[PDB]
């Protein structure tokens, strides 16, 4: 060891990581799906297909 | 005489000192709820018979 | 307190907003006023020191008045209307009453004299939400009663606030009383614009809240109320005065910084209605502010004040204490500008 | 001034005509723009807590950026439906209103008269 | 952190731990007086935790790798200077007196930390509240000046008001030609300097100050140097006493949580340590704290916070 | 009307008994502050403004309206209740119980 | 010749209880620092 | 004279405004806005208010003011003050013998000088208060009103509680 | 308009003259911010009962119990005032001038 007290942060805490990641995960196939929901319903509003 | 004292007199130096003295004006309020609210007071006769805002 | 019974009262703050920003009954607006008030007093006697009574009792009083007025305006309101929709005021004896009760709620001069002194007496949390939290229901009624603000009225409170606001924070180096006086010429600024245009208000309010909500996390984190106490972050957190730095130079409404684009899309939208004095010396005025923000950069970042020898101690030490938001709010306050036609959102 | 346009429909963050529009890219610089502000303020939160500022929570900087960019898409889609909303009613407002708008008589050069000042 | 206000919410409260042996007790004495093993015998006895008494470098045993520090980066004073030149020029007496009471507010928020988590007892040697006992004796011999003690007296005033004194302090008498004769056994050349001026202040601000202030807020227990080597004698006392004074007796689950709130942030425990008041003994100039501190961020696991120092191998960092 | 005669009658019978106490017998020669009563007296103001919203009962029992006005009714006394269990709970009914 | 730092006669001018004494704001004296004034 | 009577006590209404808010000692204010109270009642009763009236006697003088001298004899135990009184004394004489001589008159608003009794409606309510309708429709239509009502004065309960421990 | 409406506008405006003049005591201050509270319910009662307008005789209760609660908040400060200086006198609370 190096510390003469454990620190808080000495490992990580894996909850946390695995909800963040999963979190931002989520975030960007949702932002995926809606964008491409978006341009497919633009362009059956303005029929460009 | 002239860029050591009087061009920074007239512009810079009364600037400042008016805005010193108008900041000590300002905050020499002696902290007294009695005198706020009577300058409450003085504010909405002001405004009503003097500036009439409310017409 | 308890942490339950501080749960309740904060939530009991936040309902008593949100029931003034949601309700179309005048009646319902001033409960929600009276409601945020009997909910924040223990939120600034959290210490229980005289210093916060006084500053409680001070606060109690105004926004006491404030809220009689208010009623008085609303009965006025209906003798000459039969109704109580939040909407124009159908009297202008009601809506000077009205105008005056919400800058009296607000702390616009000549109203502003309990502002530096409530500010002052409580602790940096609950100062952090009267500056901010407590400006969102007044400014929420302004919006809704603008077609019967009388023009002269509400501009007088503007460039008053300005004024005196920018002239009180040049004397003080308290920052609760630094931040007071930032926050009267910030509201008149607000004002100014509300006739005109009340989305620029909204924008305003929005980025004030933002850079004051930064600089009081600033204050929390760094556990500093005095400008020389402030001074003393170099040697123990060296990032804190850069952020303090950018975080005061945006309050200067310096560009390419975010708290620049209020004032200059105020300024857009004084003089498309043919106002060019107004928006000019309120510009100026706001150089007093800027004087006053770049005294505490100067004392916090730009120099290196002298230090105790009892801070080595601290340097052994990390900050534990939740800086919430800090970073997003560093970054939001300072680097926004290339994002500013996203003001429509407000629209 | 547009309040009681979105007062028929009220608190619709992007109400269904949005839709009509065509969404922001991806690689919209605006959106980089914010995914860069993300990014900052992940430093910033590595930089005051004494974190090795580039190396550390690596997961905590992607969701700031991802955080960031995921409100900012829907940000940028309000911005620019007001702004299209705004030009609409501009446009609207000009086609019922022709006695307000006037087609002016565009003239030549050779016609107008511009008074010459000399520097000399 | 680990203790909040989601914790006080979510059922731990300090009251179900806190026994009947869950007392902070305070062993007080001259210089030499022994009640250094007295209290670790009452810790061995009463089964509490014992804290020797904060030197100089008790916040470098508190943190990093727990070894001492060198002495430009913790307490920039000496003790043994102090003992040497007692009215020197560079101000190391004042300098010394306000690091150790800063050293000791970290020791009582560490001891309050220890009683207030876990209900398990704590002995000390010396607390914040028998501190000034050195200050007033250094004052009366001319070793500082007024406005060192003005001061002291300032930052004693906004920090020991925000905790809770302790359950017993036990003082030993020890007379000064007792603590000389111990001094001179010893072997301890600087501390033989110790003068008898100095030993008689310290003392009579014991008798005639500490003892009876501490008399209505706590149990004060005073015993001879004869009486103390008898351990048994002092914990048949101890267990028998009726705690009738003082504010633990009105402390309900809100004040411990906030008590605990306060005494685990150390930096807001020792935040009104380095007020700004320009007393030349303490305040440092730019350049050297500058220098200073820049060479204490190169020092090993100091650079970055504790879990986050490659080269004391800190593992996982791109995942913290 | 008759209401202000019988008030002025009684008013004017014990202002004349009063007269008659104070000048019949004339022709012969012959605190520190208590935090607890404080406490009770705002609770009383509190529990009152509580029954004038309980008072309209009697009336409120009339309407069409019966499942809201039951809630509602049920919902103001369980509000008085619940600040008399907060008033227990917190010591605040301790030394005049 | 190298920088120039503040000193402690620069920095006592920002721990006044204003920043520009006049004759009326004289006895003004600092807050204290927890903000906590005795109980009289 | 009796035409007159909501005029003549709105007049002693003013006259003990006059005299609680020239405040000559809490005492003395405690009970010029106790006989004010009354005479508002009164007043308030002579529009056909008889609830809100009676409101007025239990709740604001029978609750509050009780409160109001209760810690004000807790807490206690000129020329300013009379001077003030008889100013806001031959004010609201110079009202009234102004709206009296000329039957109108403009201070802010206009005001007519008739008896107060001409505003009134000439038909009846059936078997039915109106007023008596309007406050117990608190329970059916009031909801959202005694939803708002209801968490104030609980959080009123905790707020005394909080800022009177001192702790 | 009708002429009881001048008087209890009048009634308003006198005790609001005496809230914004304070002599000495915070209680007197109090029993001005109440008046205040008196006159707006007499007034609103008045013109509901007038208009006969039915749903809105519930909002001077409203309009009483709020501000009573007010009024206990009211009190209940100044008891702290008063248990530090002694008296509740305005002069005392002006710690916060700097
Ligand atoms: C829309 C408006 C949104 C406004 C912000 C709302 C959230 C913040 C306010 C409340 C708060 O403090 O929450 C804690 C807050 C963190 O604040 P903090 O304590 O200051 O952060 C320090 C460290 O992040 C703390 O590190 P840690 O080690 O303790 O844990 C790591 C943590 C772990 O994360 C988690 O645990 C998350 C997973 C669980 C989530 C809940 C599941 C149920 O990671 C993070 O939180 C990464 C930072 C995330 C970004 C924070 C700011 C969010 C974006 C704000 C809007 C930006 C707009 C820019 C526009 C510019 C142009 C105008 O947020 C989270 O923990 C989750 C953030 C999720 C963001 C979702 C965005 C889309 C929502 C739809
Ligand atoms: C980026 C900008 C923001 C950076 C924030 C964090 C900075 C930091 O901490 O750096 C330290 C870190 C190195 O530090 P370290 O050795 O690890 O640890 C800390 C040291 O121990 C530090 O040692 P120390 O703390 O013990 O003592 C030295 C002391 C030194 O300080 C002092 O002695 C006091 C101050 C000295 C005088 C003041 C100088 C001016 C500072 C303020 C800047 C003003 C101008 C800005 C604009 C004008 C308007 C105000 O303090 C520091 O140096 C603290 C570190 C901070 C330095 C830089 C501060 C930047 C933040 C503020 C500016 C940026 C945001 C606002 C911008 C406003 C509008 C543009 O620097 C970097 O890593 C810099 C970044 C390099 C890589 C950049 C890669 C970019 C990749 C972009 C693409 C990927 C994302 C894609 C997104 C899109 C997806 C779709
Ligand atoms: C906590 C909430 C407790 C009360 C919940 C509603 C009780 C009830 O009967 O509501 C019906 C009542 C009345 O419904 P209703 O069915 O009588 O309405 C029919 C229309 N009238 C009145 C003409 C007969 O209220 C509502 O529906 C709307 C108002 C309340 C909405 C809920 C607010 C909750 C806020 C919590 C924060
Ligand atoms: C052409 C432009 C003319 C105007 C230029 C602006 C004013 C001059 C330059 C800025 C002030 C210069 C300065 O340093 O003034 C010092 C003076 C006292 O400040 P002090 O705190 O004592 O100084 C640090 C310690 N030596 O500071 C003061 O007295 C206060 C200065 C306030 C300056 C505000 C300027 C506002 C302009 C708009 C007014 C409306
Ligand atoms: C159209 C607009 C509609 C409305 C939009 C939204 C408006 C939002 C207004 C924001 C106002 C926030 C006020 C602060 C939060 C409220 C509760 C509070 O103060 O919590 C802080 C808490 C208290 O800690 P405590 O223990 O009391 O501290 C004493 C020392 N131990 O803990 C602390 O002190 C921790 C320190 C950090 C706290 C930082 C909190 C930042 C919150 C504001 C973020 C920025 C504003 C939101 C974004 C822009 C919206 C306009
Ligand atoms: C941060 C973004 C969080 C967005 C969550 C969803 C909010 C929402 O749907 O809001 C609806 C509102 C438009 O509603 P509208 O009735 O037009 O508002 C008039 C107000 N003057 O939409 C908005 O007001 C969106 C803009 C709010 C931006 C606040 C922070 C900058
Ligand atoms: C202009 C707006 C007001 C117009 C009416 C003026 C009424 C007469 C009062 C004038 C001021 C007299 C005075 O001495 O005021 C100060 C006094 C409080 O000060 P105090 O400490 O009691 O006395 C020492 C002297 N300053 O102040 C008071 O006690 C004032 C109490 C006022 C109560 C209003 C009574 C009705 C007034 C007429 C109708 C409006
Ligand atoms: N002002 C002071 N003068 C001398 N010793 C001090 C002073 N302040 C604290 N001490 C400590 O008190 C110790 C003497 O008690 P003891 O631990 O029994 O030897 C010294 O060794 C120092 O660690």
Redesign the pocket.
């Known amino acids: 060891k190096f510390y003469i007290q454990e620190p808080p942060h000495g490992s990580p805490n894996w909850l946390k990581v695995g909800l963040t990641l999963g979190t931002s995960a989520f975030l960007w196939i949702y932002l995926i799906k809606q964008h491409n929901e978006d341009v497919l319903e633009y362009k059956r509003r303005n029929g460009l297909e | 005489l002239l860029d050591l004292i009087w061009l920074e007199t007239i512009l810079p130096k009364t600037i400042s000192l008016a805005q010193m003295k108008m900041s000590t004006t300002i905050t020499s309020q002696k902290g007294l709820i009695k005198l706020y609210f009577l300058s409450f007071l003085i504010t909405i006769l002001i405004s009503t018979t003097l500036l009439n805002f409310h017409e | 307190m308890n942490p339950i019974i501080?749960i309740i009262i904060?939530m009991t703050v936040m309902l008593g907003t949100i029931i003034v920003?949601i309700s179309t009954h005048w009646l319902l607006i001033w409960i929600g006023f009276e409601m945020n008030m009997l909910a924040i007093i223990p939120i600034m006697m959290?210490k229980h020191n005289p210093r916060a009574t006084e500053a409680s009792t001070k606060y109690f009083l105004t926004q006491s008045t404030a809220s009689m007025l208010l009623m008085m305006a609303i009965i006025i309101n209906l003798m000459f209307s039969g109704q109580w929709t939040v909407m124009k005021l159908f009297n202008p004896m009601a809506s000077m009453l009205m105008t005056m009760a919400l800058a009296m709620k607000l702390g616009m001069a000549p109203f502003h004299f309990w502002v530096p002194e409530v500010t002052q007496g409580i602790?940096?949390?609950?100062g952090?939400?009267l500056l901010?939290?407590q400006k969102?229901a007044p400014m929420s009624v302004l919006y809704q009663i603008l077609p019967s603000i009388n023009l002269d009225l509400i501009l007088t409170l503007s460039i008053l606030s300005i004024t005196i606001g920018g002239w009180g924070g040049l004397n003080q180096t308290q920052l609760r009383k630094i931040m007071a006086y930032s926050s009267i010429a910030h509201m008149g600024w607000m004002t100014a614009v509300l006739l005109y245009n009340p989305t620029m208000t909204?924008l305003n309010?929005?980025i004030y809240?933002?850079m004051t909500?930064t600089m009081?996390?600033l204050f929390?984190?760094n556990s500093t109320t005095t400008t020389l106490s402030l001074s003393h972050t170099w040697n123990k957190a060296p990032i804190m005065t850069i952020l303090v730095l950018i975080t005061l130079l945006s309050m200067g409404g310096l560009p390419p910084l975010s708290g620049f684009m209020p004032k200059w899309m105020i300024i857009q939208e004084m003089t498309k209605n043919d106002s060019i004095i107004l928006p000019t010396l309120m510009a100026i005025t706001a150089l007093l502010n800027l004087y006053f923000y770049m005294r505490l950069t100067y004392s916090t970042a730009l120099t290196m004040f002298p230090s105790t020898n009892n801070m080595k101690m601290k340097w052994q030490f990390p900050t534990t204490?939740?800086?919430?938001?800090?970073p997003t709010?560093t970054v939001?306050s300072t680097m926004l500008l290339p994002l500013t036609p996203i003001l429509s959102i407000?629209e | 001034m547009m309040t009681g346009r979105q007062a028929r429909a009220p608190l619709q963050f992007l109400p269904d005509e949005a839709r009509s529009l065509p969404p922001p890219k991806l690689t919209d610089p605006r959106l980089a723009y914010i995914g860069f502000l993300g990014y900052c303020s992940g430093l910033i939160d590595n930089a005051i807590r004494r974190r090795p500022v580039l190396s550390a929570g690596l997961h905590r900087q992607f969701l700031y950026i991802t955080s960031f960019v995921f409100v900012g898409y829907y940000l940028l889609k309000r911005q620019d439906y007001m702004y299209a909303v705004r030009d609409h009613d501009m446009f609207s407002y000009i086609k019922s209103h022709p006695e307000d708008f006037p087609e002016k008589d565009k003239k030549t050069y050779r016609e107008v008269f511009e008074e010459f000042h000399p520097v000399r | 952190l680990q203790y909040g206000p989601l914790a006080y919410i979510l059922g731990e409260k300090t009251t179900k731990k806190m026994t009947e042996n869950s007392k902070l007790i305070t062993v007080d004495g001259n210089i030499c007086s022994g009640k250094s093993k007295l209290a670790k015998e009452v810790a061995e006895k009463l089964g509490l935790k014992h804290f020797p008494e904060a030197g100089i470098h008790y916040a470098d045993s508190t943190t990093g790798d727990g070894k001492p520090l060198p002495v430009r980066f913790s307490g920039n004073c000496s003790l043994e200077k102090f003992y040497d030149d007692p009215k020197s020029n560079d101000g190391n007496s004042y300098r010394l007196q306000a690091w150790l009471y800063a050293s000791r507010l970290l020791q009582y928020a560490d001891a309050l930390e220890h009683l207030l988590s876990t209900g398990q007892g704590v002995v000390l040697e010396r607390s914040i509240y028998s501190d000034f006992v050195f200050l007033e004796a250094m004052y009366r011999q001319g070793f500082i000046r007024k406005q060192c003690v003005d001061h002291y007296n300032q930052v004693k005033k906004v920090t020991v008001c925000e905790y809770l004194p302790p359950h017993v302090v036990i003082y030993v008498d020890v007379p000064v030609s007792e603590v000389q004769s111990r001094i001179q056994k010893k072997g301890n050349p600087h501390e033989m300097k110790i003068t008898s001026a100095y030993l008689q202040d310290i003392e009579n601000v014991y008798k005639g100050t500490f003892l009876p202030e501490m008399s209505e807020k706590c149990e004060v227990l005073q015993y001879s140097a004869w009486e103390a080597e008898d351990a048994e004698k002092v914990v048949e006392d101890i267990q028998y006493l009726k705690y009738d004074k003082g504010p633990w007796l009105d402390q309900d689950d809100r004040k411990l949580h906030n008590l605990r709130?306060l005494v685990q942030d150390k930096l807001?425990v020792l935040n009104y340590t380095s007020i700004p008041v320009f007393l030349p003994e303490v305040t440092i100039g730019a350049h050297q704290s500058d220098r200073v501190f820049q060479e204490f961020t190169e020092l090993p696991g100091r650079k970055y916070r504790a879990g986050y120092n490659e080269d004391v191998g800190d593992k996982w960092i791109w995942l913290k | 009307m008759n209401l202000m005669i019988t008030l002025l009658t009684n008013f004017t019978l014990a202002t004349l008994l009063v007269t008659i106490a104070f000048w019949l017998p004339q022709l012969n020669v012959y605190l520190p502050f208590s935090m607890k009563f404080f406490l009770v007296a705002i609770t009383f103001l509190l529990f009152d403004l509580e029954i004038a919203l309980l008072l309209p009962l009697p009336w409120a029992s009339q309407t069409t309206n019966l499942n809201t006005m039951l809630t509602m009714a049920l919902l103001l006394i369980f509000l008085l209740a619940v600040s008399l269990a907060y008033e227990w709970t917190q010591k605040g009914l301790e030394w005049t119980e | 010749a190298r920088q120039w730092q503040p000193d402690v006669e620069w920095a006592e001018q920002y721990g006044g209880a204003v920043m520009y004494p006049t004759k009326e704001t004289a006895h003004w004296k600092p807050p204290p620092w927890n903000d906590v004034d005795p109980p009289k | 004279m009796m035409t007159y009577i909501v005029f003549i006590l709105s007049i002693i209404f003013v006259m003990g405004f006059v005299g609680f808010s020239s405040k000559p000692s809490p005492i003395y204010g405690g009970l010029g806005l106790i006989v004010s109270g009354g005479v508002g009642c009164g007043i308030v009763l002579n529009f056909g208010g008889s609830f809100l009236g009676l409101m007025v006697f239990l709740i604001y003088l029978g609750g509050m003011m009780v409160v109001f001298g209760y810690t004000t004899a807790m807490a206690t135990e000129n020329k300013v003050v009379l001077g003030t009184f008889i100013t806001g004394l031959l004010m609201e004489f110079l009202m009234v013998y102004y709206v009296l001589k000329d039957k109108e008159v403009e201070i802010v608003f206009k005001f007519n000088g008739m008896g107060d009794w001409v505003i009134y409606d000439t038909g009846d309510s059936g078997f039915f208060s109106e007023e008596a309708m309007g406050i117990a429709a608190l329970y059916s239509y009031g909801t959202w009103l005694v939803i708002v009502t209801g968490w104030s004065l609980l959080i009123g309960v905790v707020v005394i509680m909080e800022i009177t421990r001192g702790n | 308009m009708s002429l009881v409406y001048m008087n209890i506008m009048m009634a308003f405006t006198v005790s609001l003259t005496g809230l914004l003049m304070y002599r000495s005591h915070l209680m007197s201050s109090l029993l001005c911010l109440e008046g205040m509270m008196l006159s707006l319910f007499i007034l609103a009662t008045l013109m509901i009962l007038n208009s006969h307008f039915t749903l809105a005789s519930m909002m001077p209760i409203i309009l009483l119990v709020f501000a009573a609660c007010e009024a206990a908040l009211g009190l209940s400060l100044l008891v702290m005032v008063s248990n530090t200086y002694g008296t509740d006198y305005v002069q005392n609370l002006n710690l916060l001038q700097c």
């Open positions: 501080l904060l920003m959290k602790p940096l949390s609950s952090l939400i901010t939290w969102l909204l309010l929005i809240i933002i909500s009081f996390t929390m984190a204490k939740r800086m919430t938001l800090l709010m939001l407000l | 709130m807001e």
